[PDB]
Amino acid sequence: PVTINNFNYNDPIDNNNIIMMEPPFARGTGRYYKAFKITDRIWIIPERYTFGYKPEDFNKRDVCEYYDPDYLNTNDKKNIFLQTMIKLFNRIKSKPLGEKLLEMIINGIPYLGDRRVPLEEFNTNIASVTVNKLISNPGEVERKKGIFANLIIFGPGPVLNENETIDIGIQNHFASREGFGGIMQMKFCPEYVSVFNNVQENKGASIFNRRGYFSDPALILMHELIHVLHGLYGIKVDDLPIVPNEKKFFMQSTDAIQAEELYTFGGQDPSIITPSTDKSIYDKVLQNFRGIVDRLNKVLVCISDPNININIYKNKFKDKYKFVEDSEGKYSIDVESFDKLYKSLMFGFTETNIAENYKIKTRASYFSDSLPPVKIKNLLDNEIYTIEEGFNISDKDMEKEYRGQNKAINKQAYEEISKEHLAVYKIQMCKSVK
Amino acid sequence: GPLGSQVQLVESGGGLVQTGGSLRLSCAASGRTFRRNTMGWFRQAPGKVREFVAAISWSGDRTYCADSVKGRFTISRDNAKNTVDLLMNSLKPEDTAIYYCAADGTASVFNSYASADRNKYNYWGQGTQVTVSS
Ligand SMILES: [Zn+2]
């Protein structure tokens, strides 16, 4: 079902899995990047993420924000990034739950249009539906061809450890938040991983019995892929800060957080959302899906590509949104189908669920303090990190109690960035709250 | 850090003006500092989404604003006084809306694209009404 492709950064462009791609925010600019199709619809561009930054932002005040302007600055570094992403995707598909996540992402193709598109119309000529591919075959006229895609993963922006998933907005509307879905993008760094100490076993523990852990970058990635899934199905939660008025037992921090993060994390985090707000979220998805089902009952033409088969795409979307059709061919929402799909998209894949299923230690809440990141020594070394078990390798006795992620135990696996990073961590681990 | 509910952004300076007039909105933050944080102004008209107006980096060295207000609206900030201001000149009826000031409570590098996204802000004021009549 899901095949992870193999390639080396210096392999030649083949206009198939290795292409020159103009990413969505560069639509029409002619800025192309060497891009690698790691699986159907998913691309890796092993370049720093630069859109909306300035070049000086990448140079040189906060131990929780790590900068390195030289990350990815050679072809070999770009190759290391590609091989690491391949390994992480193989780890994701090594269990059924992450395989299912990838299948849902691949099959969750953006609708062919957005709110600007007439109801009767399929428009592929927009940045949230296609990216341009440059074709430069020797002895031929150079040309560009728009292709479909679902996700493009870049390397990091200025701060290596600030991974983020990004949707496309136009004139204050995001197709990824309005039922249609849209090409999703990510800035991701596998080696500079988060650290956390908001875990149940520290609750009531004496200071010197507290444990702190570093994250498995496959879980970091799968957390981001849940945001991707929401944005491909058009249900990323729009403009909804959730403001705690009390510190629950699983919370370490109490800052306001977007609801999109709380559902993506799972565990206990949605429990602080009011029933009223939770119901508004459900009603919005339903209203937006009703818009899509009405579009499918009207669509007659693809205005941007006379090779698109309308009936093939109508049925792809019928399946994506789990619509039903009557004897006459009219589509509609079936409430039972809708609730099942909604529950899978919003509650079926969470950071907490995935961590438990992969036996990866995670934080007890998205409401967790920022701690300094650490650098993994070498994710490509199977003595440190494997597809099957991540850091928590049985044959090293690192599976027990997630010892392979415990900063006080698996010191072979990671490096502190500086003495100041370590000192800050030690303060956080030793501190008494009254 | 404080309970999210102890953080307050208070916008002020809204009112009624005639077409062509000017207002200066201001937002005072309390309950935590935002001296290393991007701040922005948004506006919401009846029946519409919260629309980006303008944003400003923590140092003021990087501002961004919507095309429809460029040249007429200026955002500025005074970190010592915990304020962010929006000077609105050449107001038109189309500018009528509730204006909101918003803070990105995570201290991260200003990005002009991210700064236009309401989801990148976790603290919001209750808004100040601006009405422009012909
Ligand atoms: Zn997230």
Side-chain angles (χ1 to χ4, degrees), chain A residues 52 65 164 167 238-239 254 256, chain B residues 4 62 107 113 118-120 122:
Chain A
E65 296 179 66
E164 184 178 0
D167 56 335
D238 184 1
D239 191 16
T254 54
Chain B
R62 263 273 247 144
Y113 181 73
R118 51 206 170 244
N119 273 36
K120 298 297 294 174
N122 58 332

Side-chain angles (χ1 to χ4, degrees), chain A residues 181-197:
Chain A
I183 297 177
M184 295 300 295
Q185 292 177 85
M186 194 190 300
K187 53 189 190 78
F188 179 77
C189 178
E191 297 90 354
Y192 286 85
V193 296
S194 45
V195 169
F196 56 93
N197 65 5

Side-chain angles (χ1 to χ4, degrees), chain A residues 25 51-54 61 65 67 162 164 167-169 172 177 237-239 241 243-245 254-256 258, chain B residues 2-5 36 49-52 58 62 107-113 117-124:
Chain A
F25 296 139
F51 183 69
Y53 296 114
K54 295 297 180 80
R61 197 176 59 246
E65 296 179 66
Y67 292 78
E162 274 188 13
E164 184 178 0
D167 56 335
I168 295 158
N172 288 294
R177 310 179 196 185
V237 182
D238 184 1
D239 191 16
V243 188
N245 51 40
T254 54
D255 55 326
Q258 290 293 330
Chain B
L3 275 171
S5 52
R36 287 300 178 275
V49 295
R50 276 216 201 109
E51 303 186 341
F52 176 61
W58 68 262
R62 263 273 247 144
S108 68
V109 179
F110 184 92
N111 182 286
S112 53
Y113 181 73
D117 174 12
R118 51 206 170 244
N119 273 36
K120 298 297 294 174
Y121 301 80
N122 58 332
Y123 288 110
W124 294 78

Side-chain angles (χ1 to χ4, degrees), chain A residues 223-224 227 261 366:
Chain A
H223 172 100
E224 294 311 319
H227 291 313
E261 297 297 351
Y366 198 75

Side-chain angles (χ1 to χ4, degrees), chain A residues 263-299:
Chain A
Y263 288 105
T264 296
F265 190 85
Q268 304 303 121
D269 284 5
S271 73
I272 70 170
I273 298 176
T274 65
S276 175
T277 297
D278 180 70
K279 178 182 190 292
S280 74
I281 288 168
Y282 173 89
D283 292 340
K284 189 165 197 210
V285 173
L286 176 57
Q287 169 183 29
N288 286 338
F289 283 16
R290 287 187 180 120
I292 301 302
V293 78
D294 177 55
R295 281 173 180 272
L296 296 173
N297 289 329
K298 284 170 171 49
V299 60

